[PDB]
Every structure is written in C-alpha cells, then in structure tokens.
Amino acid sequence: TPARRRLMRDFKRLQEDPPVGVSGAPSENNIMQWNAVIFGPEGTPFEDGTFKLVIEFSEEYPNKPPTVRFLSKMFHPNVYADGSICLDILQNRWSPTYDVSSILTSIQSLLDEPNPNSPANSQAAQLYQENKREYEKRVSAIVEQSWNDS
C-alpha cells in the first residue's frame, strides 16, 4: 500500500539524517504504530525531560496526518489531559511533505514556544501567562517523572 511504502521512507530518513534530541521507530512488527521520544530542549523548563510518545498512522497517510499522543505525563498549554497535542501542522495545516522527523522536531519546538490562544490545558495556559515562576515548578515535576516512566 502507498502508506506502508511512505513509512519505510520516513524510517530511512531518520537513519540518514538523524534529528538532534528526538527519535522514533515502529513498535514490535507493526509499521502503522510507532514509538517515539522527545528530549526537553536545553534552556527551557522542560530541559532534561525524556518524554515518551506513540504515533498512529492510517492507510491514508501521507494525505492524512497521524495522531500523536504523549504517554509520559505532560504539563503544557497545548497538550490535552490524555496526551493529545494541539499543533496546527497535525490538524488543519497538515501537508504531505511533513514526516516523522519533522513532526517530532515541530513538537520539540512547541515545548518552549506555547501558543496562548489554544488552551488545551487551561491551568498550564493560565500559569504560563500569569505566574511563570509556578509554571516552571509544575513542569519540573513531570520532568522528574519522565525518568522512571517505563
């Protein structure tokens, strides 16, 4: 199928041009479900976090974006309670030129650049705007938790 042919190319690109601070691979023997890891970027409240995600593709990929969820506990204005991510390029701004590598690096960039007008987590959105001191403390807890996560 076209989706499976595309996903083998996504995987090869990750090996040839490895992105810094992120990684992804198929789970077990299923090409349509991937595991992924994103490191919290240095110089941010998320620094040193080792966050685990799952990516689910459909047979309509790359014409349809995959669904991406954090499995690790998260505290971020654009991340829902169930780990789902409000990021424009994973919804209405999706393009077939994006792949696993670019999706992961886009999510990585979102961690230190939250969108205030999309409050998926209303408390994280409020603290980020009002009390940035308390925002970093709440993010610190989930950084620690991401280390003994499996």
Binding site: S23, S27, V37, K52, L71
Partner: peptide, 21 residues
C-alpha cells in the same frame, strides 16, 4: 501498561535521542 510492555524499545529510543544533547 504500554510504556512498561515496550520498556526495551523505549530505552533504545531514549539512547538515540540523548546523543548530542
């Protein structure tokens, strides 16, 4: 549940993501 069952797989991914950090 999921993270625990795929412990080995996630640790390989953590090691790959750590490089150059």
């Amino acid at each position: 549940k999921y993270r625990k069952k795929h412990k080995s797989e996630f640790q390989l991914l953590v090691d790959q993501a750590r490089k150059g950090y």
